Design a protein around this ligand. Structure first.
Ligand code: JM9
Ligand code: HEC
Ligand code: HEC
Ligand code: HEC
Ligand code: HEC
Ligand code: HEC
Ligand code: HEC
Ligand code: HQO
Ligand code: SF4
Ligand code: SF4
Ligand code: SF4
Ligand code: F3S
Lengths: 951, 164, 55, 342, 164
């Protein structure tokens, strides 16, 4: 036996031109969530996509991405993505499909085109929309009929009600000092999420020299990242937000209904109304996509009269090709299916059978057509139901384009030839237009040439932005008479069912995504499952559980007793409740959401699938049959009845409160302006009786006086809890996906966790405290002292060196870690057999085997790469001393943070941003009484409350 | 005996793979793509053709450091066959039938710099459809960055001044 | 397994060509048809001084 | 008792290698020459555990074999078959019972006792230290080395009584292992259990005396946590069950001693559960809180190490004497001399 | 041995990425056929090379110097910081078939990471296979360490220098 096997090597037959072997290469592509593309810098290691970063030249990117764009790598490398053309489940040929499609359309060319239809998602692609217009001009009796379940139909109808025309409303939050969100979850992924979060956090970040901060007001049923990052939150029912907006309009002076509300709601109303009419052009009122068009038009009227047009809100030309009511188009399409007037049906993406509301009976209406065409990257429920399923190329391997939330039309650049073949929607429409075997690259180049030119195409492909495709600003005329001539619907009596996109699976497209299913959800920390999220008071009043829920209300005298009572209120999560909403039964387990509104239940869309992959095959319980086309986001009356049968719902936290400890430090803005050290002064005055702690250690440590000392600073004031840093860390560092059973055993693998904490003076509606906890890389590391083989040691640079080749189990590093950031490979968690996951693995980070410990390394792949680059530049210039710049190292969490809460840099360099943030008075480290000297310090959350509401 | 993380599941730079048809995890360039902030608008920078003819020019002015880089890249990639002095006398031409072109002849003395860039990037005449054909110079687009190819052409001009 | 001892090269090598070219590229001299050599680190300086055509 | 020590150390030396996670790399904790130039840290307490467990097993086996060598001579003399003479002959090494050899033997036994007393105190102090050098609030407790010494002597004499009593009643050893032997072994049980009760009082005093929220929550978690069954059963099995051992009739009673020894063994397992699992369950950050639920496989491994211990013990009582043949005839000579001295 | 000591091909002609990335380039069949389109064609020992470049199938060479994938060697910084190929790979210019000159031990790596002055060379004698260290070599090794700014053994013996 030898030390190693033979280990054959495989070079190229022809070397690539612009590639140096071993140097990772960055390509500017575009990834779409709901049709609105965002610019991404996807890293090609050896001709294949491995890590998605942000494009700083791109409007909705700004260098940071969201969790869906971060997990698009594993969505691409899903092993259950479709490989062949399926005629009736049997494999077929694309050429034979195009022959049959040409025969079907030349049989349908006897008429003008009445039998041929279409069903796409929200299309912002200009080339693809031009091809749809060409197909509609060729067949004038064909219709577009686009639909996606998470859409902006209500925003489109609100714009049409307010202005009489379709506009795109983009918000400038850098110039906004008061933000009002009427169920507007703009700090969650969607149109313009990264730009909105970046501008909001840039205004939110406060220093010694800072004089102003922004204030956020939210009304919502489901607490979210937006309600987490809000100074004030009022939990109304989701159908009462219309009456809230009417009362706000009436007290602001514009047309609205003087609705009657709770005393807390009218106090929050007058707090908003007093904070407004004091920032004219420095305020913004945002309405959610789930809110009715009357709420959208009323927010438009409030922003118009408040002077916010041209300063914080902006009205542009519509960017989503043809704006329409997608749910009404789907109702018209299934009415045509029931009438039998449809013969040819073509779909691109969407998964309409799974994603349609259950009152339309999409499968039964679809079974009557003669032939169907589907294209959705998977053999989904619809593709299994349809004839003629064609695999769709991933955006990371497909040519195309996509407009942003403000309009950019950015080119979707592939980083690889498609693994399984498969055609794009441009190729499908080229084959539909009598041009088979056409290249999507040639199609998008033919569209973009003679529109921006060859030099414009080359500039746009090198960059990620076309400079001449921005939506121009317009001045639409507000129609206050049409706003006033509205029914203004009131909230309905009974239990309402609020339909919500999932934070991890979105609408269920990411259902097989292992990173997104294994990822703990915001506000609930759930994994691999769906739940009926509700308030504890609602759970008691509905299921009759033997508790009080008035024992969560109190003060700091009985705060620990209230936290113990919340721990007793826990565990009950998982009780399966039979919910009869409108002729349909879901029978979903419940989960306690303390921030949630009373008499409401939120069910996350995107679960209960049947034709997903091996990962997430039957996770969760489906909500789409319960969902109706009349109210696709709200509910009126639901029979939620407890039916025993407690299900195993798995969380990664299992304790929800801060047990009287100085971990999440909260301050106010005015006392921060007076003295920025008062948070730490009050904490150490209550703990020790002195303003400063005289922490004394018996260990000297190392020096760090003339060397590159690396540290992290996490801003708790500018963290929303979007888990994009966690998905980026998983993608960069090859963290394994463990099972739901392995998380239930307590063995989740995440180098960074976002710790929600529910601290407040009433636990039936607390404040949400999200904080990223990774390895602090402690200078005096209790994990390092207890390692018997020196598998974890400390650097000259100041990093704890978790060596996996050396780690021999013994699991003591994790017991001496006070933050428990270290994750152990108890079993063979990393996949060894899936070639797609093997391609998804980062070549520059090791893949851990069973029996070793792993934790956060400050992305030492990037640290070592920048150090090697700096030393190589130093000896090539003869400087005899390497200098690493402040922006030279950017970790994965810092890059993919859309807010910029995480900053990485040098400690000993005083001009670095981390040293400037650590020179602030509200910077602190966790558990300083343990003499660890953490290098990942935290900036205390500084709130900005209003005197009419809190002070 | 250990064999734990010695040959990992991740794919290394030139690791073979059974997933792809050519048996290689290293993937070629997608036809028609460019990296981030690597612009290709200067046609003279990436090929020697402007209007269908030779140019005899340079996209950037000559520098002593550029000429030293061109000398280094000439000694690495071009002096194996053409020789260090550029007279076409080398062990490759001695052992085989290469016989490369002398830079100090009249045809290469009055040859354009754009023609030098074209012959580095692409090479010479390929296989003709009539009476056969073959390629000899073979082109060096994949191995040499185009700025370094222009530096090689500048060093070719320097060697032509050296031997005249 | 001892360190292997390869057979030495008993024929003509590239070293004669390289040494002859480096001798011809230095210490000036005359060719068979031309006027005079200009050595390396001199003709490059003349090329830099006289410039090259641009665009 | 020394055979039980050797077999218990044999059962407990597999547990590092068994729990190690990469079991074949136990030798990386040992200072051994390698091509890497790597060393064990030696600042961790698990390297001290390597040295302490290796020294404890080696010196215990050496002292047991030294105490067996004239018993090997006695068995070699008392054997009948000529081929089992050489089985104990090569282990006795020709002992001869010489008075010159007895002087060196007694000096070596005295020095081995005076080296093995601080050896065993240091071994159980180091096994205390592999929690006590950590910053865990249930583990950063400085009375752990004498507390673990007392708990080990407590559980050890519980197991010793629980295995003398069937040996005494099934072999004819009532003349050798006596009611006075059981009485004094239960007296040492009562003393060391009182020291462990004092250690419980020290931990409770530290939690109440400290203003530290983590010590206060350690006491709260032990008293009223999800794993408070271990603490309450521990208090019953190590405090309530030892107050009968003050009484002379209960100390002399055999089935009461068996019940008390079994209860003490169960409560000492509960003590080690309370020290390790409850302190690791709830830590500084409340987000990193979870419950430890043991599976069927570590229970199966526990039952299996019980079987390995009893297999080694039954092999020992088959091929070797349970009690020392010499030093008990020397004890008889000493009692005869005491009777002659009146 | 033939291709360097006889033909005279520079090491960067075939290992093109050795001074720029961590991975020294295993050459392509395009790089081989650049000369072997004319020299020794229709030969059974170049039959495998001619079998490649017509299909996409590569030449499956065997990795002589195989590091166990948690080690992360970087060729570029080692070459640019004055460590020649002969001090770490041996006289590959005289190797007919490449052998491993030494085992790539962690201790052997740390020997030069702790005492680099015994093995550092002028950064311009790295590709020279004829270079031998001088009679003393310690004074000029300390001089070159100070000249190139080579880090102390604490920095070079840090775990995350190599492992990851
Ligand atoms: C924090 C670290 C503390 C260090 C502790 C050191 C204690 C080690 C003592 C070993 C026992 C030897 C006594 C022999 C003997 O039986 O003495 C006889 C007299 O006969 C003789 O002439 C002596 C025979 C040879 C003695 C040489 C000993 C070799 C050196 C030991 C190597 C250790 C290293 C560190 C140098 C009569 O005397 C006695 O019997 C008295 C025995 C007293 C037992 C002590 C019990 C204390 C238990 C606490 C243990 C503390 C922990 C930290 C280990
Ligand atoms: C040996 C394999 C060669 C190497 C290395 C390079 N070239 Fe070459 N080159 C070679 C041959 C056999 C020929 C002549 C081909 C023919 O059919 O006659 C050439 C040609 C040139 C020319 C002249 C082109 C012409 O006159 O039309 C030039 C200017 C030239 N080669 C330059 C050149 C440079 C700069 C190289 C390094 C990148 C180079 N060659 C490599 C053989 C070989
Ligand atoms: C000692 C510090 C070295 C020097 C100087 C050079 N190489 Fe290297 N080489 C070295 C090691 C330890 C390895 C194994 C790396 C691995 O991951 O397996 C290698 C490997 C190569 C290879 C194989 C391909 C690769 O791994 O990059 C080649 C082709 C190679 N080395 C060639 C090479 C040349 C030509 C060098 C001088 C410029 C050179 N290496 C420098 C050790 C060292
Ligand atoms: C041009 C500079 C070459 C490159 C690049 C490669 N080889 Fe070569 N090879 C070349 C010559 C001039 C010779 C000797 C010819 C002679 O008559 O002695 C060789 C030799 C070989 C051989 C031996 C063939 C034989 O002796 O019949 C083989 C098998 C060979 N070369 C393979 C080879 C490969 C695989 C290469 C790419 C890494 C390669 N050579 C490069 C010229 C050149
Ligand atoms: C192209 C004609 C080459 C030149 C010039 C040099 N090497 Fe090379 N190298 C080449 C090939 C085709 C291979 C793989 C096949 C093999 O025989 O190993 C290599 C490999 C090496 C290695 C082995 C690395 C490994 O696979 O583990 C070493 C150590 C190496 N090359 C070093 C090296 C040096 C120092 C060179 C200049 C004198 C050199 N090679 C020239 C192709 C070519
Ligand atoms: C002497 C011949 C060496 C041997 C054997 C190895 N390395 Fe090396 N290494 C050497 C030098 C002179 C340097 C320069 C660094 C400096 O500051 O001067 C390095 C550095 C590295 C690095 C760069 C990391 C950093 O500088 O922060 C890496 C990644 C590295 N060495 C890896 C490495 C490995 C894995 C080795 C064993 C196969 C190894 N080196 C051996 C010199 C020498
Ligand atoms: C680069 C100069 C290294 C540094 C710094 C460290 N190690 Fe290393 N490690 C390196 C090499 C070249 C090897 C392979 C050794 C071989 O014989 O092939 C290793 C390997 C190890 C191992 C052995 C792994 C195994 O056999 O499974 C261990 C246990 C190891 N390295 C640990 C280790 C630690 C803890 C280090 C920091 C103090 C460390 N190594 C430094 C290269 C380098
Ligand atoms: C060759 C003797 C080595 C056997 C003992 C190993 C030491 C050792 C190793 C470990 O990983 C431990 C983890 C927890 C508790 C004790 C431990 N001990 O003692
Ligand atoms: S730190 Fe992580 S959770 Fe917080 S905002 Fe940034 S990406 Fe989201
Ligand atoms: S945060 Fe935990 S793992 Fe990181 S250095 Fe500190 S104790 Fe070790
Ligand atoms: S710095 Fe890098 S390794 Fe550390 S938690 Fe963030 S992404 Fe993960
Ligand atoms: S204690 Fe040490 S041996 Fe590994 S599991 Fe932890 S780094």
């Amino acid at each position: 036996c030898t030390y190693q096997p033979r280990q054959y090597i495989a070079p190229f037959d022809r070397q690539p031109e612009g590639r140096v072997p071993g140097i990772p290469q960055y390509f500017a592509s575009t990834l779409t969530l709901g049709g609105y593309g965002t610019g991404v810098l996807v890293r090609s290691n050896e001709g294949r996509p491995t890590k998605v970063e942000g494009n700083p030249r791109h409007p909705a990117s700004l260098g940071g991405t969201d969790l869906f764009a971060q997990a698009e790598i594993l969505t691409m490398y899903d092993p259950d993505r479709s490989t062949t053309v399926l005629r009736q489940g049997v494999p077929s040929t694309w050429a034979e499909f195009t022959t049959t499609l040409g025969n079907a359309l030349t049989a349908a060319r006897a008429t003008q085109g009445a039998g041929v239809r279409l069903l796409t998602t929200t299309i912002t692609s200009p080339s693809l929309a031009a091809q749809i217009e060409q197909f509609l001009q060729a067949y004038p009796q064909a219709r577009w009929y686009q639909y996606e379940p998470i859409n902006r139909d209500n925003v489109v109808a609100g714009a049409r009600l307010a202005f009489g025309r379709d506009v795109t409303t983009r918000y400038d939050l850098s110039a906004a000092q008061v933000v009002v969100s009427l169920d507007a979850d703009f700090l969650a992924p969607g149109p313009g999420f990264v730009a909105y979060a970046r501008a909001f956090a840039e205004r939110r970040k406060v220093r010694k020299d800072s004089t102003t901060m922004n204030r956020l007001y939210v009304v919502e049923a489901s607490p979210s990242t937006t309600g987490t990052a809000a100074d004030h939150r009022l939990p109304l029912r989701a159908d009462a937000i219309a009456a809230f907006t009417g009362a706000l309009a009436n007290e602001l002076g514009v047309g609205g209904a003087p609705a009657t509300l709770s005393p807390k709601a009218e106090e929050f109303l007058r707090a908003i109304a007093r904070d407004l009419e004091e920032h004219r052009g420095q305020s913004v009122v945002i309405a959610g996509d789930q809110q009715p068009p009357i709420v959208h038009a009323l927010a438009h009227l409030i922003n118009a009269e408040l002077g916010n047009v041209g300063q914080t809100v902006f009205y542009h030309e519509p960017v989503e090709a043809r704006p329409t009511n997608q749910t009404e188009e789907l109702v018209a399409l299934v009415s045509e299916m029931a009438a039998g007037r449809v013969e040819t049906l073509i779909m691109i993406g969407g998964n309409p059978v799974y994603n349609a509301p259950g009152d339309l009976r999409f499968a039964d209406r679809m079974a009557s057509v003669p032939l169907t065409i589907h294209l959705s990257q998977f053999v989904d429920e619809t593709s299994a139901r349809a004839t003629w399923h064609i695999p769709q190329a991933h955006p990371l391997e497909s040519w195309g384009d996509a407009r942003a939330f403000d309009g950019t039309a950015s080119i979707v650049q592939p980083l690889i030839e498609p693994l399984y073949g498969g055609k794009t929607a441009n190729e499908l429409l080229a084959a539909m237009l009598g041009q088979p075997e056409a290249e999507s690259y040639d199609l998008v180049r033919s569209f973009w040439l003679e529109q921006i030119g060859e030099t414009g195409w080359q500039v746009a492909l090198a960059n990620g932005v076309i400079a001449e495709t921005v939506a121009p600003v317009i001045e639409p005329t507000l129609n206050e008479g049409a706003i006033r001539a509205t029914p203004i619907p009131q909230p309905g009596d009974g239990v309402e069912i609020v339909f919500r996109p999932d934070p991890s699976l979105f609408d269920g497209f990411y259902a097989n995504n292992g990173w997104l299913q294994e990822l703990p959800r915001p506000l609930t920390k759930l994994v691999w499952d769906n739940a009926a999220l509700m308030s504890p008071r609602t759970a008691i009043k509905l299921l009759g559980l033997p508790f009080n829920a008035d024992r969560l209300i109190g003060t700091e005298a009985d705060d620990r007793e209230r936290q113990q009572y919340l721990e007793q209120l826990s565990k009950v999560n998982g009780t399966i409740a039979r919910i009869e909403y409108r002729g349909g039964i879901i029978e979903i387990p419940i989960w306690l959401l303390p921030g949630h509104a009373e008499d409401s239940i939120t069910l996350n869309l995107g679960y209960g699938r049947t034709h997903a992959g091996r990962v997430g095959n039957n996770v969760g319980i489906d909500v789409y049959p319960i969902r109706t086309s009349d109210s696709p986001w709200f509910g009126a009356g639901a029979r939620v009845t407890n039916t025993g049968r407690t299900y195993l719902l798995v969380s990664t936290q299992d304790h929800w409160t801060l047990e009287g400890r100085d971990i999440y430090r909260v301050g106010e803005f005015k006392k921060f302006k007076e003295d920025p050290k008062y948070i730490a002064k009050e904490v150490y005055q209550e703990e020790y009786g002195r303003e400063t702690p005289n922490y004394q250690s018996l260990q000297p440590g190392d020096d760090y006086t003339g060397r590159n000392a690396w540290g992290m600073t996490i801003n708790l004031n500018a963290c929303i809890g979007c888990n994009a840093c966690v998905v980026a860390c998983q993608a960069e560092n090859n963290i394994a996906v463990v099972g739901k059973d392995q998380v239930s055993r307590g063995r989740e693998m995440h180098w960074i966790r976002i710790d929600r904490y529910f601290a407040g003076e009433d636990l039936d509606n607390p404040s949400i405290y999200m904080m990223p906890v990774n390895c602090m890389q402690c200078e005096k590391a209790p994990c390092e002292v207890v390692c018997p083989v020196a598998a974890t040691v400390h650097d000259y640079e100041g990093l704890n060196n978790m060596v996996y080749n050396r780690c021999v189990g013994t699991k003591y590093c994790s017991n001496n870690c006070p933050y428990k950031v270290r994750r152990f490979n108890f079993l063979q968690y990393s996949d060894t057999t899936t070639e797609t996951f093997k391609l998804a693995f980062n070549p520059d980070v090791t893949v851990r085997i069973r029996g070793v410990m792993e934790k956060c390394t400050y992305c030492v792949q990037r640290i070592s790469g920048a150090r090697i680059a700096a030393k190589r530049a130093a000896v090539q210039a003869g400087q005899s001393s390497y200098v690493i710049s402040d922006g030279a190292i950017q970790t994965a969490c810092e890059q993919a943070c859309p807010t910029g809460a995480i900053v990485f840099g040098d400690i000993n360099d005083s001009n670095s941003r981390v040293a400037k943030w650590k020179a602030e008075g509200h910077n602190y480290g966790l558990l300083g009484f343990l003499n660890t000297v953490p290098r990942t310090t935290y900036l205390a959350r500084v709130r900005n409350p209003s005197e009419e509401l809190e002070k | 005996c250990h064999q734990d993380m010695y040959d990992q599941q991740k794919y290394t730079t030139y690791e073979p793979s059974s997933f792809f048809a050519d048996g290689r995890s290293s993937r070629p360039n997608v036809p028609g793509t460019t990296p981030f902030e690597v612009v290709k608008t200067d046609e003279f920078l990436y090929t020697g053709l402007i209007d269908g003819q030779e140019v005899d020019a340079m996209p950037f002015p000559v520098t002593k450091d550029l000429l030293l880089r061109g000398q280094l890249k000439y000694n690495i990639y071009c002096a194996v066959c053409h020789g260090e002095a550029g007279y076409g006398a080398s062990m490759v031409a001695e052992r085989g039938g290469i016989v490369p072109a002398n830079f100090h002849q009249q045809r290469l003395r009055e040859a354009p710099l754009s023609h030098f860039f074209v012959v580095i990037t692409n090479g010479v005449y390929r296989g003709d459809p009539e009476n056969g054909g073959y390629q000899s110079m073979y082109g060096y687009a994949s191995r040499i960055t185009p700025e370094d190819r222009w530096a090689i052409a500048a060093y070719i001009r320097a060697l032509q001044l050296s031997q005249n | 397994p001892f360190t292997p001892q390869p057979a030495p090269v008993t024929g003509n090598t590239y070293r004669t060509y390289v040494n002859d070219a480096r001798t011809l590229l230095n210490s000036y001299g005359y060719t068979m048809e031309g006027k005079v050599h200009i050595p390396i680190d001199r003709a490059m300086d003349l090329i830099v001084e006289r410039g090259l055509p641009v665009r | 008792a020394e055979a039980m020590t050797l077999f218990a150390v044999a059962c407990a030396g597999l547990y590092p290698i068994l729990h190690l996670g990469r079991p074949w790399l136990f030798y990386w904790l040992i200072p051994y020459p390698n091509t890497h130039g790597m060393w064990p840290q030696f600042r961790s307490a698990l390297a001290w555990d390597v040295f302490a467990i290796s020294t404890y097993a080696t010196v215990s086996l050496v002292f047991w074999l030294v105490g067996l060598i004239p018993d090997f001579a006695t068995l070699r003399d008392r054997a009948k078959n000529i081929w089992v003479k050489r089985l104990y002959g090569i282990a006795a090494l020709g002992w001869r019972g010489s008075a010159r050899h007895w002087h060196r033997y007694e000096m070596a036994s005295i020095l081995l006792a005076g080296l093995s007393t601080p050896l065993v105190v240091s071994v159980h102090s180091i096994i205390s230290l592999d929690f006590a050098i950590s910053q865990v609030p249930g583990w950063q407790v400085t009375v752990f080395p004498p507390y673990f010494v007392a708990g080990a002597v407590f559980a050890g004499f519980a197991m010793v009584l629980l295995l003398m009593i069937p040996v005494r009643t099934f072999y004819g050893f009532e003349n050798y292992i006596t009611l006075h032997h059981l009485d004094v072994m239960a007296k040492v049980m009562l003393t060391t259990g009182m020291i462990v009760v004092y250690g419980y009082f020290m931990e409770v005093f530290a939690s109440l005396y400290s203003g530290n929220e983590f010590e206060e929550y350690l006491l709260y978690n032990r008293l009223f946590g999800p794993s408070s069954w271990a603490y309450w059963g521990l208090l019953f099995c190590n405090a309530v069950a030892i107050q009968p051992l003050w009484f002379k009739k209960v100390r002399q009673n055999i089935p009461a001693l068996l019940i008390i020894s079994l209860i003490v063994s169960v409560g000492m397992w509960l003590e080690r559960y309370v020290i390790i699992v409850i302190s690791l369950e709830r830590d500084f950050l409340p987000s990193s809180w979870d419950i430890y639920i043991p599976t069927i496989w570590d229970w199966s491994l526990y039952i299996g190490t019980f079987g390995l211990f009893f297999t080694l013990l039954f092999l020992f009582i088959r091929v070797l004497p349970m009690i020392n043949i010499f030093e008990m005839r020397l004890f008889l000579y000493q009692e005869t001399e005491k009777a002659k001295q009146r | 041995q033939l291709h360097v000591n006889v033909v005279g091909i520079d090491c960067r002609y075939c290992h093109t990425s050795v001074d720029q990335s961590y991975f020294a380039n295993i050459p392509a069949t395009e790089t081989c056929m650049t000369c072997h389109s004319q020299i020794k064609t229709y030969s059974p020992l170049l039959e495998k090379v001619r079998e490649s470049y017509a299909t996409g199938k590569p030449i499956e060479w065997v990795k002589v110097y195989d590091l166990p994938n948690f080690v992360y060697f970087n060729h570029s910084i080692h070459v640019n910081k004055g460590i020649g190929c002969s001090t770490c790979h041996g006289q590959v210019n005289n190797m007919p078939v490449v052998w491993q000159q030494q085992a790539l031990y962690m201790g052997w790596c740390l020997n030069c990471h702790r005492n680099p002055e015994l093995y550092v060379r002028p950064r311009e004698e790295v590709y020279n296979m004829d270079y031998v260290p001088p009679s003393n070599q310690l004074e000029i090794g300390r001089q070159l360490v100070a000249e190139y700014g080579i880090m102390p053994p604490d920095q070079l013996t840090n775990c995350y220098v190599c492992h990851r």
